[PDB]
Amino acid sequence: GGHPTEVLCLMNMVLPEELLDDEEYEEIVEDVRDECSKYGLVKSIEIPRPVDGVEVPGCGKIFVEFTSVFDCQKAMQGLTGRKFANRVVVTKYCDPDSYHRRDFW
Amino acid sequence: GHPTEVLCLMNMVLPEELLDDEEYEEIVEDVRDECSKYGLVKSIEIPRPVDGVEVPGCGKIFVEFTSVFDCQKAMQGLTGRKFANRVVVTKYCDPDSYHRRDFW
Amino acid sequence: GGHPTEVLCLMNMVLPEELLDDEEYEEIVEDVRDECSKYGLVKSIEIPRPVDGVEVPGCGKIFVEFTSVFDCQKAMQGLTGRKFANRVVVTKYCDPDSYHRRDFW
């Protein structure tokens, strides 16, 4: 949500429909990791994609776990309002416990 | 309630999502397809909104399976946090009531 | 979100616009408390309303803190899909720490 954490949530960048293709999916994950790594070490990344037809929790969102709240906030500073795939990047934080239990919503 | 062959799904659709014919048809298909993972779907009812006319059960999805066993599997599989942006809540429905459209 | 907690979130029931009037606001709070109290002790309730023109976090949502996750889940069982003010009640949970810091989103 709005309370700062070490997990960045990047919104508005992808639709469920575009994560179906494995090659395109892997490219998006790498692009995200590379871009975020500019702001600090990325511990982990989650980009939920459809599984067996199901729009799973967090589909359409990208979650990036940093090793500090500062690095997450620097990535928010740097990435918010940029454009990717002709869409404006929207940012918020993710509760770490919610991230680890994949309650992405 | 004891298990039956009819399952009611709540928090799965809002009325406003069922106004457009194409969107409604797409939802029926998607729900049928999801339920068919658990067993043969015999029928489905998703009551559609009509402004200013009472539509019992609008906001709910009722699915009829060919067996109580399959319906039990579907209650386990569909209830909870497996879908985006919702917590699915379920209940078994009396099949005779379902066929009469006595939806609560 | 989807992980069960002691805080129930009731959605789709009110718009920010209808919480402006103090009398109507107080009636909604009481109606909620009375209805939820059927399922267990209500420790606290939050119904964010506009403050000095600002659609504050959680406006349009109603948050009810119970003393157990069971009581919250019983209220979810009983209230989900009911109608209030001609609107279908939609339910989810709220992270307790998010509730206490008013990160209602």
Next chain:
Amino acid sequence: GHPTEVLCLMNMVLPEELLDDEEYEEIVEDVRDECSKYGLVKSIEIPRPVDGVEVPGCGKIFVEFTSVFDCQKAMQGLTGRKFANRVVVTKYCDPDSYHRRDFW
């Protein structure tokens, strides 16, 4: 950057929210009113989307105050989690650039 009389607000509006004329006008008013809590608003720019034509700064809100002091108050007041469903991120903008519409 050092403080200036122009503030850029991010995560406050999406392009799709600015397509309708009435909705756009309502957003401009609401943003003006919110900013006016901190000082006199001299001007505001909310670049509007045009499909297939590049619109620099679309997705951002730029507000010009009559003083750097008021703008500093507005950065403190508007940045963070005070508004529903968003985390407002801000930055100071070069006033000359703002007047030229050199929006980044």
